[PDB]
């Protein structure tokens, strides 16, 4: 039949993320397409070019599907020796442009923007309750453009829904610098909990289910602070805390470029995704039961709990947690930017993403725009 190989950049799954996201594009296109799949997982970064050449090398695979950034890099030198072999690129873009080379990247600002109207939000809400101060968060994994482009839309809309409404809510950004490393991903959090962060959005793959974990003993401690998840809605991991998941379709682009190839329609290029296309978007009801369903069925959902509860107690929280002109404001920035009527700068270099965060920091929000 058709054969596949789906290449992982770091962790391979067990994310709970990004590369569950992929597997599971894969794992539909295996079965309603009845396409083979192999998973491969490279055990260094040294190593990737050479394990990326000896798949090509091989002719065994119709499609080589590279899940990460990183892959860039290696992709860059290997695809024109092989101009025969297909290769989808996921979460990135080759610096030339191949035949051979189907790149499918997000605008990340798009929904980390929406995200960070939102975990500024909740922040006002807790210190309003509370009285105490109360920072909107996140932990990162690698310093990278995707990541960038997170940071970018997250710092945004704080300050959007902080000049719409006259709020001072601060951001802290922390880069792990790794996305396998659930250990770092905890004490990171601890760290923050404890200079103020009680919203704290997850950008790094495995590496923040440390930080849910961190944000649920803060939680049985007593203390009000909530988590936001990424790529996946992963709220079925821990309700109480984990309020709304930012959604990246990357299972959609897998089998997006899977089925292209199984029906003889592939051609080389660059596909950009964002909230217009389905390609991002927020957690709501059918979402979270539909992950929690697929957990519950993997038996690794948390006890005393069913999908159905799952979705009542997100939804009795976001009822509590996330006022009316924090959606109100949502609303209002999706609808600009699905309209055209906003559009964000893919930074160039690191230096240029550096002053865009200067800019944004200082309240000169147009700095991310055109
Ligand atoms: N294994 C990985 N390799 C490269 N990037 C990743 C990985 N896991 C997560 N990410 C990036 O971090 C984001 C947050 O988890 C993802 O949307 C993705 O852009």
């Given at each position: 039949p058709?054969?596949?190989?789906?290449?992982?950049?770091?962790?391979?799954?067990?994310?709970?993320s990004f590369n569950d996201m992929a597997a599971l594009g894969a794992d539909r296109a295996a079965e309603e397409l009845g396409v083979d799949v192999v998973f491969?997982?490279?055990?260094?970064?040294?190593?990737?070019?050479?394990?990326?050449?000896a798949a090509s090398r091989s002719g065994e695979y119709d499609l080589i599907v590279l899940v990460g950034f990183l892959w860039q890099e290696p992709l860059e030198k290997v695809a024109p020796r092989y101009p025969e072999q297909k290769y989808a690129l996921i979460d990135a873009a080759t610096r030339e442009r191949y035949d051979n080379v189907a790149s499918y990247?997000?605008?990340?600002?798009?929904?980390?923007?929406?995200?960070?109207?939102?975990?500024?939000?909740?922040?006002?809400?807790?210190?309003?309750?509370?009285?105490?101060?109360?920072?909107?968060?996140?932990?990162?994994?690698?310093?990278?453009?995707?990541?960038?482009?997170?940071?970018?839309?997250?710092?945004y809309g704080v300050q959007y829904y902080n000049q719409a409404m006259g709020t001072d809510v601060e951001m802290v950004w922390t880069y792990t610098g790794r996305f396998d490393d659930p250990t770092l991903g905890k004490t990171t959090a601890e760290q923050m909990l404890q200079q103020g962060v009680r919203?704290?959005?997850?950008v790094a793959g495995l590496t923040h289910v440390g930080m849910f974990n961190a944000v649920k003993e803060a939680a049985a401690r007593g203390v009000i602070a909530f988590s936001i998840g990424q790529d996946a809605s992963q709220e079925w991991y821990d309700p109480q805390t984990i309020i709304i998941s930012g959604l990246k379709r990357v299972d959609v682009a897998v089998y997006t470029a899977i089925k292209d190839v199984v029906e003889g329609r592939f051609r080389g290029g660059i596909v950009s995704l964002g909230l217009k296309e389905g390609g991002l978007g927020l957690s709501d009801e059918e979402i979270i039961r539909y992950f929690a369903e697929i957990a519950a069925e993997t038996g690794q959902l948390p006890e005393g709990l069913t999908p159905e509860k799952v979705v009542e107690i997100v939804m009795s929280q976001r009822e509590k947690w996330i006022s009316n002109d924090g959606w109100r404001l949502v609303e209002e920035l999706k609808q600009k930017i699905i309209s055209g009527e906003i559009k964000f700068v893919t930074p160039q270099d690191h230096d240029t993403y550096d002053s865009i965060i200067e800019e944004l920091k200082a309240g000169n929000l147009e700095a991310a725009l055109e």
């Open positions: 058709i054969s596949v190989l789906v290449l992982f950049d770091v962790g391979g799954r067990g994310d709970l491969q997982t490279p055990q260094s970064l040294a190593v990737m070019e050479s394990v990326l050449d990247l997000f605008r990340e600002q798009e929904v980390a923007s929406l995200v960070g109207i939102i975990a500024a939000d909740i922040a006002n809400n807790i210190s309003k309750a509370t009285g105490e101060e109360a920072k909107a968060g996140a932990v990162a994994g690698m310093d990278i453009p995707p990541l960038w482009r997170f940071h970018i839309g997250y710092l919203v704290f959005y997850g």
